[PDB]
Amino acid sequence: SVSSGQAHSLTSLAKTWAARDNEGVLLTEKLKPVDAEYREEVHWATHQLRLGRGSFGEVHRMEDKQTGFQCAVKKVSLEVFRAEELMACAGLTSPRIVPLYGAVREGPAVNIFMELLEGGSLGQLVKEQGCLPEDRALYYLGQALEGLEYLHSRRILHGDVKADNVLLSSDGSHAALCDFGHAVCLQPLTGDYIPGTETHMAPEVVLGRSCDAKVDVWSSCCMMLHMLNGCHPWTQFFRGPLCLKIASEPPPVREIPPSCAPLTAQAIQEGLRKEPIHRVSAAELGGKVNRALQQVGGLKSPWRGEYKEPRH
């Protein structure tokens, strides 16, 4: 059956789902079961207009019929369901990670319920604006790294850090990490891995070497270059596949715009060190990014300003 409760009940129940009628745990007052049940189109209803596409399923705006509260729902098949989806975001203290409202299995699918962020993704903002000004880029990279810092401290690796997996609030002030389908647990180094976006992959993952929290740091600076240039790393210079180039070529520091401040350029360099032992952690890179943001003048640029042309 489907009960109200707390994160540990959901995670241990997530292990039984990932190991393989209506069961789960709702972690918030907004979503309420009726007679210990919670079923699609019966106790809650999906909206027709889709929110987007996740890694292992489409994301929809839903609405609880009793309470009237709306949330995001990602339907993931049991055949591709990973317990790390919920363990990466269940009961987290950080505001820079999209909070889990609950997870409920209904037959062959698992319905993951998450808080709505109405501002769209950072990827959509970059597509619309063309590219973001330096202070806006630093600001969002700073908040992404606060989220990563917190995840890494809890032995969780995101595994697909990019603009599409960073949601924004309506006013652009708050940013948070979403989509934990590539999430991996860390031991006192990584375990089993699902591949993220090729352009954001660290050299250690392509070389087949042992990976750790520093993979998300590499990806976060690839996301920084994307924000600044309007295009992913590598793609202006090479055509796919990129794995042999990522392994052999120098890190894409040449894609740092020359307009950038000293501390911004230096921050991107330390985050894009090829050897993960030489590469800064999330917490360390976050410090550099905050200091670089202060150097440039803080967050001055307007929320959805003019269209800056991407690099060609």
Ligand SMILES: CNc1nc(-c2c[nH]c3ncncc23)ncc1F
């Ligand atoms: C589209 N990809 C994903 N999106 C969200 C998500 C949560 N809350 C949201 N609010 C507004 N848009 C989107 C979302 N979660 C996981 C995903 F894989």
